[PDB]
Design an enzyme around this catalytic site. Structure first.
Site, PDB file in Angstrom:
ATOM      1  N   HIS A   1      49.905  44.624  46.208  1.00 59.12           N
ATOM      2  CA  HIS A   1      51.044  45.448  46.641  1.00 59.12           C
ATOM      3  C   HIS A   1      50.733  46.436  47.774  1.00 59.12           C
ATOM      4  O   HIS A   1      51.631  47.054  48.288  1.00 59.12           O
ATOM      5  CB  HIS A   1      51.713  46.171  45.468  1.00 59.12           C
ATOM      6  CG  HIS A   1      52.254  45.265  44.438  1.00 59.12           C
ATOM      7  ND1 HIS A   1      51.459  44.569  43.562  1.00 59.12           N
ATOM      8  CD2 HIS A   1      53.516  44.943  44.122  1.00 59.12           C
ATOM      9  CE1 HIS A   1      52.211  43.846  42.753  1.00 59.12           C
ATOM     10  NE2 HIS A   1      53.459  44.111  43.028  1.00 59.12           N
TER      11      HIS A   1
ATOM     12  N   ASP B   1      47.272  40.903  40.886  1.00 60.12           N
ATOM     13  CA  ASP B   1      47.425  41.915  41.886  1.00 60.12           C
ATOM     14  C   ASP B   1      46.209  42.054  42.744  1.00 60.12           C
ATOM     15  O   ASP B   1      45.625  43.159  42.838  1.00 60.12           O
ATOM     16  CB  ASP B   1      47.785  43.197  41.213  1.00 60.12           C
ATOM     17  CG  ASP B   1      48.317  44.262  42.210  1.00 60.12           C
ATOM     18  OD1 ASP B   1      48.698  43.947  43.329  1.00 60.12           O
ATOM     19  OD2 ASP B   1      48.374  45.442  41.760  1.00 60.12           O
TER      20      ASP B   1
ATOM     21  N   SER C   1      44.722  52.728  44.092  1.00 60.35           N
ATOM     22  CA  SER C   1      45.120  51.302  44.023  1.00 60.35           C
ATOM     23  C   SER C   1      44.287  50.447  44.930  1.00 60.35           C
ATOM     24  O   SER C   1      44.106  50.848  46.108  1.00 60.35           O
ATOM     25  CB  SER C   1      46.566  51.215  44.382  1.00 60.35           C
ATOM     26  OG  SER C   1      46.922  51.954  45.493  1.00 60.35           O
ATOM     27  N   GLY C   2      43.749  49.295  44.496  1.00 61.43           N
ATOM     28  CA  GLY C   2      42.963  48.440  45.361  1.00 61.43           C
ATOM     29  C   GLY C   2      41.509  48.711  45.372  1.00 61.43           C
ATOM     30  O   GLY C   2      40.727  47.891  45.782  1.00 61.43           O
TER      31      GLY C   2
END
Ligand SMILES: NC(=O)c1nn(CC(=O)N2[C@@H]3C[C@@H]3C[C@H]2C(=O)Nc2cccc(Br)n2)c2ccccc12
Length: 230
Positions: free
Chosen positions: A41, A89, A183-184
């Protein structure tokens, strides 16, 4: 990162900042000489801008000899990812050229055996994500150590209510936590990449809403195919 402290500069030479027009969006992890792993995302808002990856960094703004901002040749979101879910994801970013390696830029070994990290294991997460509820962005890399949370607890109705598949893992979120902009980024256990912070919206720092991380070992076939696609 909430509840964390400033990292030792360059002590995590795999750490990447994934950027959109020179603004940090997500963490990432250097997993091969030319490839950075992050979350799918992260490029949601990226279509009309330039995606880049900052390697060798401690501060996002200050000059450092090892800092280099790479252009991205290709962005490869996992083909089963969807907006609105946090399954699958993962995102692989192929740098414009092989990264220059040294003591401050080096790939992180990643877990290839598909077995659960045992619960309570202390794992490291680092990031340039928000550092308070007001949304303050740090200029320099933060980190925190978080115990892995067992999947049965993470799945309870009180927690994530059966959403934690075999391909995900959780860590505690009691005050100390990963958050927006982390995130990530990598969840590292015993010096090996085990997880990638997911990139769906969530509360941070609430023990009943544990952090969720995608298990890299679960995706080993996918990572290997993309990495070979050069
Ligand atoms: N793991 C979580 O706890 C979590 N993940 N996300 C996603 C996230 O984070 N981003 C999504 C992928 C894009 C880019 C990116 C972003 O906004 N980046 C951003 C925005 C403002 C400040 C900074 Br630093 N980074 C959250 C959003 C809200 C609350 C918690 C989180």
């Amino acid at each position: 990162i909430l509840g964390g402290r400033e990292a030792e500069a360059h002590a995590r030479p795999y750490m990447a900042s994934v950027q959109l027009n020179g603004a940090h969006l997500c963490g990432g992890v250097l997993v091969a000489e030319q490839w950075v792993l992050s979350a799918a995302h992260c490029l949601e808002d990226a279509a009309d801008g330039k995606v880049q990856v900052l390697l060798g960094a401690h501060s996002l703004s200050q000059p450092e000899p090892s800092k280099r901002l790479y252009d991205v040749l290709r962005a490869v979101p996992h083909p089963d990812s969807q907006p609105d879910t946090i399954d699958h994801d993962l995102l692989l970013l192929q740098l414009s050229e092989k990264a220059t390696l040294g003591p401050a830029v080096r790939p992180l070994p990643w877990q290839r055996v598909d077995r659960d990290v045992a619960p309570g294991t202390l794992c490291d997460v680092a990031g340039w994500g928000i550092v308070n509820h007001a949304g303050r962005r740090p200029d320099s890399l933060q980190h925190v150590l978080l115990p892995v949370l067992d999947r049965a607890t993470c799945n309870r109705r009180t927690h994530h209510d059966g959403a934690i598949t075999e391909r995900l893992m959780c860590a505690e979120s009691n005050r100390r936590d990963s958050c927006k902009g982390d995130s990530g980024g990598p969840l590292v256990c015993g010096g090996v990449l085990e997880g990638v912070v997911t990139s769906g919206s969530r509360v941070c720092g609430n023990r009943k809403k544990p952090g969720i991380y995608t298990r890299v070992a679960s995706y080993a076939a996918w990572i290997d195919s993309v990495l070979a696609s050069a």
